[PDB]
Amino acid sequence: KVFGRCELAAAMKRHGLDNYRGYSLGNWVCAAKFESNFNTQATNRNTDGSTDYGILQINSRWWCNDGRTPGSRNLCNIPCSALLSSDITASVNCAKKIVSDGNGMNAWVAWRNRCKGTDVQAWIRGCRL
């Protein structure tokens, strides 16, 4: 599923992401925009052989099992394919674990490079919360 901007904002808000660990909703939407272009089916393979999955491009090296990343941890205790569902619950729940990791949203390279220190609230402008 490819979400609309406001549709995703609403779903994220409902799943408790607004101000989660101090990150306003705009941050999460911006991150999803640049990580996956709002497509839950997004996958990208990394040089180290790990793969990034779904709306928030969660990495198989640490967070999920895809059965093809030797020495991978599965810290979210989920198959990576669960991150590709049109239901964003699994992605959100795992993201919460990631952002609590100690490094906040800096775990998402596109957030750091493209959202951090920008007017992130612009991403939720015009949306019926």
Resolution of the experimental model, in Å, one decimal: 1.9
> Which residues are CB-contacts of 23 (< 8 A; sequence separation ≥ 6)?
17, 99, 104, 105
Binding site residue list for substrate:
101
Question: CB burial class (10 A; 0-12, 13-18, 19+) of residue 22?
Answer: exposed
Domain that holds residue 17: 1-129
> Which residues are CB-contacts of 3 (< 8 A; sequence separation ≥ 6)?
11, 32, 38, 39, 40, 55
Binding site residue list:
101
Active site (annotated) includes residue 7 = no
Which approach determined this entry? X-ray
Indicate which residue of 7, 35, 66, 119 is catalytic: 35
Indicate which residue of 52, 66, 87, 119 is catalytic: 52
Which tokens belong to 99?
């952002």
Looking at residue 78, which CATH number applies to its domain? Answer: 1.10.530.10
DSSP letters for 38-73: TBTT-EEE-TTS-EEETTTTEETTTT-B-S-STT--
- Domain count for the chain, please give it: 1
